[PDB]
């Protein structure tokens, strides 16, 4: 399948060179996989989700996304026009309030919730969790991410936006999950992206068009926007049978475009997520 005039980040993950505008992907498109988006919520009624999104848990007064961030990230995972895995099932867990903030105890509870809830859902091709959030180092937050991964869920987390070593941030610094940095459309490390030895992979993160609340769209930037490209890619590859939740981060790194990014400090991987699609 081919989507013409795609957002640049989708085109980039299906190309060995920057500057293309078509997203090439297998028609299976993540069908049969499930992705939990742990964030401010998802506007499940947005036409771009085609009925494939639902909220399953909130830690606040409402399950509505009053912010937009969670709806944007979910759109990059799996909306029709803006998504990597266009036929996946999306589940929303609202651990952040409508200002985008949340306490670590709530974020931990939401991770433990997903590890249990996936046993009630029909996800025959596997389960992914996308965490476009973080803060300062916490061993308890890292431990919760490690538990979620151990339970059989592919966990992708944002590296953070401080132009610093991600070893000082959580859950970015948990080695056993998939920690995602951001790049821009000229194959530079995004100027805000964290770096360091704990990063596993880069994905598109600057000027990313996706869904927004009120049935709208907008473009924003962050490692929050790179993470759902990798979460969606994992769901897509698990549906194709190429990898499993336990090994998907390693598989994505092994099959990435290697050495193409600029402004990568010594000691950080130079690997850009790539779907390897051949018609
Ligand atoms: Ca890792």
From Swiss-Prot:
Paired cysteines (S-S): 34-123, 178-249
Q: Identify the enzyme class.
A: hydrolase
GO MF terms, alphabetically ordered: metal ion binding; serine-type endopeptidase activity
Keyword annotations of the record = Calcium, Disulfide bond, Hydrolase, Metal-binding, Protease, Serine protease, Signal, Zymogen
Where on this chain does Ca(2+) 1 bind? 175, 177, 200
Query: Can you tell me which residues bind Ca(2+) 2?
Result: 16, 260
* Enzyme Commission no: 3.4.21.64
Does Metal-binding show up as a keyword for this record? yes
Give cofactor(s), names only: Ca(2+)
Q: Name one GO biological process term.
A: proteolysis
Q: How is the cofactor bound?
A: Binds 2 calcium ions per subunit.
Q: Which GO terms describe its cellular component?
A: extracellular region
Q: Does the keyword Calcium apply?
A: yes
Active site: residue positions: 39 (charge relay system), 69 (charge relay system), 224 (charge relay system)
Main function: Hydrolyzes keratin at aromatic and hydrophobic residues.
For this chain, the family text in UniProt reads: Belongs to the peptidase S8 family.
Which protein, by its recorded name, is this?
Answer: Proteinase K
The gene name on file is PROK
Q: Entire protein: which part is shown?
A: 106 to 384 of 384
């Amino acid at each position: 399948a081919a989507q013409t005039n795609a957002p640049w980040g989708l085109a980039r993950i299906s190309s060995t060179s920057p500057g293309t505008s078509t997203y090439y992907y297998d028609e299976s498109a993540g069908q049969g996989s499930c992705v939990y988006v742990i964030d401010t919520g998802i506007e499940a009624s947005h036409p771009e989700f085609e009925g494939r999104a639902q909220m399953v848990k909130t830690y606040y007064y409402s399950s509505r996304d009053g912010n937009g961030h969670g709806t944007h990230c979910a759109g990059t995972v799996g909306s029709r026009t803006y998504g990597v895995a266009k036929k996946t099932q999306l589940f929303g867990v609202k651990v952040l309030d409508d200002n985008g903030s949340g306490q670590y105890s709530t974020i931990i509870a939401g991770m433990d919730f997903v590890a249990s809830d996936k046993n009630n859902r029909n996800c025959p091709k596997g389960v992914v969790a996308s965490l476009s959030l973080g803060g300062g180092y916490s061993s308890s937050v890292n431990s919760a991410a490690a538990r979620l991964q151990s339970s059989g869920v592919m966990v992708a987390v944002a590296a953070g936006n401080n132009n610093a070593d991600a070893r000082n941030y959580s859950p970015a610094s948990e080695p056993s999950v998939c920690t995602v940095g951001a790049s821009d459309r000229y194959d530079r490390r995004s100027s805000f992206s964290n770096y360091g030895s704990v990063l596993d992979i880069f994905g598109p993160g600057t000027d990313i068009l996706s869904t927004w609340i009120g049935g709208s769209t907008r473009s924003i930037s962050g490692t929050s926007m790179a993470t759902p490209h990798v979460a969606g890619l994992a769901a897509y590859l698990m549906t194709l049978g190429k990898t499993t939740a336990a090994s998907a981060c390693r598989y994505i790194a092994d099959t990435a475009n290697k050495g193409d990014l600029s402004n990568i400090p010594f000691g950080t991987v130079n690997l850009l997520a790539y779907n390897n699609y051949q018609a």
